[PDB]
Amino acid sequence: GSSGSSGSGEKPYKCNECGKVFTQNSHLTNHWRIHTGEKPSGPSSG
């Protein structure tokens, strides 16, 4: 079978706005920037 459970494997830091994953904190917090404005009105990139 296949186990699809996150937590241990994935990193403790994960963007709760799109679904990204980073190794450090400063990286995650920073990323959010792109989410907070910056021409958020357009074609979804995903």
Q: What angle do CA 40, 10, 43 make, to 5 degrees?
A: 20
Site string for Zn ion, 8-37 (x = CB under 5 A): -------x-xx-x-----------------
Q: Which is nearer to Zn ion, 8 or 33 (CB)?
A: 33
Q: Are 14 and 20 in contact (CB under 8 A)?
A: yes
Options 7-15, 22-30, 38-46: segment touching Zn ion (CB under 5 A): 7-15
Cα(10)–Cα(14) distance, integer angstroms = 8
Positions in the binding site for Zn ion (CB under 5 A)? 15, 17-18, 20
